[PDB]
A and B are shown apart, each in its own frame.
With several copies, the nearest count.
Chain A
């Protein structure tokens, strides 16, 4: 089967091995490569590895699929498909016992703690170089644990000789055999014949009594190891650790083939197995004959080294070659390939129903359609077409269907037309930044070989039409297509998840056409008459009795909040034509319809009536303004651009002023730099006085049209600067000098010629200078922004919110922030969309504004802003009580729709993307400060807090640092240590408060942490990043960011863990286990006097000993209840960095594909843990449906199917 969860790991016994192995490898060679024939019983052995190709043996007796179930006589091979080769094992049976490397390279080697030996000492006993007492018996004076090498056997034996009675007079029936060994066999027998439960209880007793620091510390580490072993009852007994027999890998993952040059491409692991096997063979040859003990020692130690190297080499000092050293690649390193293997291509993939081609602008399609060349559509949808030909009945074979769909002869495309109509397609950008780079669409046939795409969607892709080569995908499963046309489809995706801005603000040409329609000219066709609104206006325009545009008076209906006034407005056909389309819930539109106003209107209509409505509005305004812009026939000409006559005057005039300031500096009274300053000032003055007169003259020539004037003023494209160049001086340009200089100081003489007249050679040279300077600057800035983007996108990854309410009637006191000169961030967006706490009323009496637990609305928000209320209490994703998530009502507005966030949707990755992407514009700011604040690093510029309160009184000064205590009505004068080179915000007679910073620089998380709480530290850093992102002119609502900080408050440090390591400074998110489990789960049975029934391993019977000799040696526990302490689990929350916070995640696949597989697999296989797969990243890797979206509800909710 394949459906799985709830996976467990353990260590198996040698006996279960060879069940899946078809035989031992008895021929040490790898493969007969000089004949290219398979090697029997070799590293490439068909007999043990099954068929080497589908339905064949190594001798070629069988070579075809017809041989189902037959067996080759020569080789023990099933003659079936090649697949079965990838599962069966073989084995290598090692002659000498061998000790496992992985235990040894562990810092807490479980053998080391259990037996209690010096590391190198046990290394020696394994490596045969020394002996050690293993089972002495009645040994004269040497204990079981002495360290000793030579001549002890001589003395003990020649003193002891008594009789041969204990099975060679040794301590299996009878002691008096002082016996010693070297490593593997001794530890084997010791572990297999030892018990530790009484050891555990005496560890309890000594931890009650013995030496506190060293003895208790190390022996409680030992206690961890032993009770982790004992915690298993399908027990992982240490007996299994011996690697007596090691299975062998199929050649299927270790291919071999002769390439050019007489060389075969084979895995280094194959060579390693070859070497290990051949050294085992030399062990056989040098031991089976009665060789001296030295030969046996050398061979056995060499074999131990060989197998250790095979399983994980390079641990000992490796060969160094400066250019690129190539040691033999290992098996473990191909297991622990985090970014070599397990990161990019483990997830990045090929795809099989995709296509790729170039895109072109669509001026006819709707917002939910796309143009699709005939062959791409003829090919992606091919299987569906194949079925529909099948259901035709005209075809019976998919081969014939392929024959007819490939050559594409004069038969029906009707099926492509149909299927294309309800089977949307996913359009896919290459460098997807935030989700609005992936959408679905309804596809549509067009002519040619290009992808037609609607003009107003590309801004979501943030692309240009240079010729890019967008990708397309086909879902193939109806659940997927439903998700597509229900959530993916573009019409529903009109908002910016970053913040409430609209995404599809229309472009230059539509805004130009709309600006064209709605001007106001005084006297034209049909001035001053009367209408009824629609009918009379459309008639009088449609018969040329009035032009498109003339001030007319008309009788129209608009709502006064929000009713129903119908008056005589003065307006123009045109504005009437468009306002035929503004929905009948806002009233009537009377302004010159720029870009600013267009965004205002689209916002108001969305906020008043919702998504589908505002979509239809935007589509139709597109179409009409776009046609009108065309029929107006707008173009550009030289006569359009009038240079001002006075420019020839004005440019001249400044010269004489320049002349004087020349002669002034000629007489030298004026400094050179201030000469520079004065001349640049004068030339800037003349630049401005030319530019403004230019623009006004541009306006007034028709007031109805000047291609440049309307292209500028309507905000289609352009600026005052560009147009000034097109008709006035180029301005000033910088003297950069490009190297070792700031640039800065600029040329004394401006580039006075404008692009109209042409440029002299030198000026054009200076322009090339500056322009390529700017291009180089842009290139380097893009390079700089790339690293910020990649890292800060790699900040975070996490799990979802999970409850409909969070009960925590203890929310934040939210107010508006003003930074010491004015207000820069409003409460309006700070309050908007966030559930409220207590019903609020206006100071004007008797007007309930909100009901508790209601979605605050924009109208309500405006009313509140108008009201003289100062702050309000609302919930914070922080204060959520609900563990393993956040409550629905905790968070608030969805920001993608405009609704309350609903159950089941992942907020975290959204917050990540939205907070990372503006980094590309992010230009101390930048990556440094951001990562400094996330990753809990010291500011290196030591700012601290006052941590107490009082009224400031200046003490002694001038030490190079300032020992100052403010004051304390409490009674303290503890002295702080801010160095003098640190700016201080402290002034005499002021009243400081506890936790108040006193010095410049960033406050360490510890100060505010300890003296103010996680809420305080989180709000501090939220404010800080919001400040910087605001200073870089990018708007982000704090919610996203506030999610991230939550993950970093989750950690505690435990100071008094009486019943665990006392150093498990674990995550306070795992705060439940702190007292609930209490090693005994709340001391429910910490008692022996009545009954415990678990510690009955003591001689417990009523017998005046369950009732008078109360139960055991310590009458109850003789000092305190079983612990020598009450067992508090005292702890204090401590902040951490995002990187480490990720590192301390609790899951074995999660960490294993994160960092250091060895440590985590060690701890896990030690603990024998089971994992139920109930994680996001974990289940991503396992290739099942993730525990979000689906995986909260409809993870249940599956019967009926």
Chain B
């Protein structure tokens, strides 16, 4: 099994796998530590931002690679968007600085 692009879930922008639907492999903690050990410049960043869990960013990066711009523009994952939303703020003081 293998996969490049595939169907997207409705609970998170992560595509599941299992060869029932191709999906991918678990990019677990230990290889996060391995790319830590050497100086992962954009490997780790694109793994945790655009390789997975950014359907908007994934669509943009795909369309760019096919459209001739290989330079990405990584932003903020929903995990942090979720973080601001789930923390619930209160009387809300998030930052713009």
* Number of residues of chain A lying within 8 A (CB) of chain B: 85
| A495–chain B nearest beta-carbon distance, Å | 14
> Which residue from A87, A349, A1185 sits with its C-beta under 8 Å from B26?
A349
With A353-B51, A354-B3, A387-B65 known as contacts, the answer to whether A432 contacts B85 (CB < 8 A) is: no
Contact assessment for B65 and A476 in the assembled complex, using a CB-CB cutoff below 8 Å: yes
Contact assessment for A356 and B25 in the assembled complex, using a CB-CB cutoff below 8 Å: yes
Contact assessment for A7 and B86 in the assembled complex, using a CB-CB cutoff below 8 Å: no
Contact pattern, A 328-358, Cβ under 8 Å of B = 1, otherwise 0: 0001001100000000101111111111110
Per the 8 Å Cβ criterion, residues 48-95 of B in contact with A are 48-49, 51-53, 58, 61-62, 65-66, 68, 70, 72, 74-77, 79-82, 85-95
| B16–chain A nearest beta-carbon distance, Å | 7
Residue of A nearest to B43 (CB): A480
Q: Please give, as numbers and ranges, the residues of chain B lying within 8 Å of A390 by CB-CB distance.
A: 66, 68
- The segment from A8-16, A507-515, A1049-1057 found at the interface with B is A8-16
Contact assessment for B85 and A910 in the assembled complex, using a CB-CB cutoff below 8 Å: no
Of B2, B16, B23, B97, the most chain A CB neighbours within 10 A belong to: B2
> Which residue from B35, B48, B65, B79 sits with its C-beta under 8 Å from A383?
B65
Interface membership of A475, Cβ < 8 A = yes
> Which residue from B30, B34, B42, B47 sits with its C-beta under 8 Å from A351?
B47
Contact assessment for B37 and A909 in the assembled complex, using a CB-CB cutoff below 8 Å: yes
Contact assessment for B76 and A4 in the assembled complex, using a CB-CB cutoff below 8 Å: yes
> Which residue from A253, A349, A375, A1184 sits with its C-beta under 8 Å from B14?
A349
Residue of A nearest to B49 (CB): A1183
Contact assessment for A398 and B95 in the assembled complex, using a CB-CB cutoff below 8 Å: no
- The segment from A529-537, A762-770, A1186-1194 found at the interface with B is A1186-1194
Contact assessment for A376 and B2 in the assembled complex, using a CB-CB cutoff below 8 Å: yes
With A351-B24, A1186-B44 known as contacts, the answer to whether A905 contacts B65 (CB < 8 A) is: no
Interface membership of A628, Cβ < 8 A = no
| B45–chain A nearest beta-carbon distance, Å | 5
Interface membership of A431, Cβ < 8 A = yes
| A354–chain B nearest beta-carbon distance, Å | 5
Contact assessment for A909 and B97 in the assembled complex, using a CB-CB cutoff below 8 Å: no
Q: Please give, as numbers and ranges, the residues of chain B lying within 8 Å of A487 by CB-CB distance.
A: 38-39
Contact assessment for A1183 and B45 in the assembled complex, using a CB-CB cutoff below 8 Å: yes
> Which residue from B1, B26, B70 sits with its C-beta under 8 Å from A355?
B1
Q: Please give, as numbers and ranges, the residues of chain B lying within 8 Å of A14 by CB-CB distance.
A: 91
Contact assessment for B75 and A435 in the assembled complex, using a CB-CB cutoff below 8 Å: no
Interface membership of A6, Cβ < 8 A = yes
Residue of A nearest to B52 (CB): A349
| B11–chain A nearest beta-carbon distance, Å | 8
Q: Please give, as numbers and ranges, the residues of chain B lying within 8 Å of A9 by CB-CB distance.
A: 93-95
| B27–chain A nearest beta-carbon distance, Å | 5
> Which residue from A344, A910, A1185 sits with its C-beta under 8 Å from B41?
A1185
Contact assessment for A2 and B76 in the assembled complex, using a CB-CB cutoff below 8 Å: yes
Interface membership of A477, Cβ < 8 A = yes
> Which residue from A8, A255, A335, A906 sits with its C-beta under 8 Å from B87?
A335
| A350–chain B nearest beta-carbon distance, Å | 5
With A240-B91, A1189-B40, A1190-B39 known as contacts, the answer to whether A476 contacts B46 (CB < 8 A) is: yes
* Number of residues of chain B lying within 8 A (CB) of chain A: 69
Q: Please give, as numbers and ranges, the residues of chain B lying within 8 Å of A433 by CB-CB distance.
A: 30
Contact assessment for A1183 and B37 in the assembled complex, using a CB-CB cutoff below 8 Å: no
Residue of B nearest to A904 (CB): B39
Contact assessment for A350 and B23 in the assembled complex, using a CB-CB cutoff below 8 Å: yes
> Which residue from B29, B43, B77 sits with its C-beta under 8 Å from A483?
B43
Q: Please give, as numbers and ranges, the residues of chain B lying within 8 Å of A8 by CB-CB distance.
A: 93, 95, 97
The A-B contact count (CB < 8 A) is 216
> Which residue from B3, B68, B90, B97 sits with its C-beta under 8 Å from A352?
B3
Q: Please give, as numbers and ranges, the residues of chain B lying within 8 Å of A335 by CB-CB distance.
A: 86-88
Q: Please give, as numbers and ranges, the residues of chain A lying within 8 Å of B76 by CB-CB distance.
A: 2, 4, 1182-1183
Q: Please give, as numbers and ranges, the residues of chain A lying within 8 Å of B80 by CB-CB distance.
A: 1181-1183
Q: Please give, as numbers and ranges, the residues of chain A lying within 8 Å of B42 by CB-CB distance.
A: 477, 479-480, 483, 1185
Contact pattern, A 380-394, Cβ under 8 Å of B = 1, otherwise 0: 101110110010000
Contact assessment for B4 and A379 in the assembled complex, using a CB-CB cutoff below 8 Å: yes
Q: Please give, as numbers and ranges, the residues of chain A lying within 8 Å of B43 by CB-CB distance.
A: 475, 477, 480, 483-484
> Which residue from A16, A349, A484, A909 sits with its C-beta under 8 Å from B27?
A349
Contact assessment for B4 and A477 in the assembled complex, using a CB-CB cutoff below 8 Å: no
Residue of A nearest to B1 (CB): A356
Contact pattern, A 243-257, Cβ under 8 Å of B = 1, otherwise 0: 100010110010100
Q: Please give, as numbers and ranges, the residues of chain B lying within 8 Å of A7 by CB-CB distance.
A: 94-95, 97
| B63–chain A nearest beta-carbon distance, Å | 9
Q: Please give, as numbers and ranges, the residues of chain A lying within 8 Å of B86 by CB-CB distance.
A: 253, 334-335
Per the 8 Å Cβ criterion, residues 62-96 of A in contact with B are 86-87
Residue of A nearest to B23 (CB): A350
Contact assessment for B85 and A253 in the assembled complex, using a CB-CB cutoff below 8 Å: yes
Contact assessment for A471 and B87 in the assembled complex, using a CB-CB cutoff below 8 Å: no
Contact assessment for B88 and A331 in the assembled complex, using a CB-CB cutoff below 8 Å: yes
With A353-B4, A476-B46, A480-B46 known as contacts, the answer to whether A17 contacts B31 (CB < 8 A) is: no
> Which residue from A16, A347, A910 sits with its C-beta under 8 Å from B37?
A910
Interface membership of A1004, Cβ < 8 A = no
Interface membership of A488, Cβ < 8 A = yes
Contact assessment for A352 and B33 in the assembled complex, using a CB-CB cutoff below 8 Å: no
Interface membership of A428, Cβ < 8 A = yes
Q: Please give, as numbers and ranges, the residues of chain A lying within 8 Å of B62 by CB-CB distance.
A: 383
| A1097–chain B nearest beta-carbon distance, Å | 29
| B20–chain A nearest beta-carbon distance, Å | 14
Q: Please give, as numbers and ranges, the residues of chain B lying within 8 Å of A715 by CB-CB distance.
A: none
Q: Please give, as numbers and ranges, the residues of chain A lying within 8 Å of B61 by CB-CB distance.
A: 476
Q: Please give, as numbers and ranges, the residues of chain A lying within 8 Å of B30 by CB-CB distance.
A: 431-433
| B12–chain A nearest beta-carbon distance, Å | 9
Contact assessment for B91 and A6 in the assembled complex, using a CB-CB cutoff below 8 Å: no
Q: Please give, as numbers and ranges, the residues of chain B lying within 8 Å of A334 by CB-CB distance.
A: 86
With A1184-B45, A1185-B42 known as contacts, the answer to whether A909 contacts B33 (CB < 8 A) is: yes
| B14–chain A nearest beta-carbon distance, Å | 5
Interface membership of A437, Cβ < 8 A = yes
Contact assessment for A355 and B31 in the assembled complex, using a CB-CB cutoff below 8 Å: no
Q: Please give, as numbers and ranges, the residues of chain B lying within 8 Å of A379 by CB-CB distance.
A: 2-4
Contact assessment for B41 and A479 in the assembled complex, using a CB-CB cutoff below 8 Å: yes
With A253-B85, A382-B4, A483-B40 known as contacts, the answer to whether A352 contacts B93 (CB < 8 A) is: no
> Which residue from B28, B32, B39, B49 sits with its C-beta under 8 Å from A905?
B39
Interface membership of A438, Cβ < 8 A = yes
| A222–chain B nearest beta-carbon distance, Å | 24
Contact assessment for A249 and B85 in the assembled complex, using a CB-CB cutoff below 8 Å: yes
Of A356, A382, A484, the most chain B CB neighbours within 10 A belong to: A356
> Which residue from A247, A428, A478, A1183 sits with its C-beta under 8 Å from B79?
A1183
| B48–chain A nearest beta-carbon distance, Å | 6
Residue of B nearest to A797 (CB): B33
Contact assessment for B70 and A435 in the assembled complex, using a CB-CB cutoff below 8 Å: no
| B71–chain A nearest beta-carbon distance, Å | 8
> Which residue from B26, B31, B37 sits with its C-beta under 8 Å from A913?
B37
Residue of B nearest to A379 (CB): B2
Q: Please give, as numbers and ranges, the residues of chain B lying within 8 Å of A1190 by CB-CB distance.
A: 39, 41
Contact assessment for B37 and A350 in the assembled complex, using a CB-CB cutoff below 8 Å: no
Contact assessment for A17 and B92 in the assembled complex, using a CB-CB cutoff below 8 Å: yes
Q: Please give, as numbers and ranges, the residues of chain A lying within 8 Å of B79 by CB-CB distance.
A: 346, 1183
| A14–chain B nearest beta-carbon distance, Å | 6
Contact assessment for B51 and A352 in the assembled complex, using a CB-CB cutoff below 8 Å: yes
Per the 8 Å Cβ criterion, residues 902-917 of A in contact with B are 904-906, 909-910, 913
13 A-B pairs, CB-CB below 8 angstroms? Answer: A8-B97, A348-B29, A349-B47, A349-B53, A351-B52, A352-B3, A353-B3, A380-B4, A477-B42, A477-B70, A483-B39, A483-B43, A913-B37
B: residues with CB less than 8 A from A are: 1-6, 11, 14-17, 23-49, 51-53, 58, 61-62, 65-66, 68, 70, 72, 74-77, 79-82, 85-95, 97
Closest 7 CB pairs of A and B: A1189-B39, A355-B2, A10-B93, A351-B24, A12-B91, A2-B75, A7-B95
Inter-chain pairs besides A350-B23, A1181-B80, 9 sampled, C-beta below 8 Å: A247-B89, A247-B92, A331-B88, A352-B24, A375-B2, A432-B31, A487-B39, A1186-B36, A1189-B40
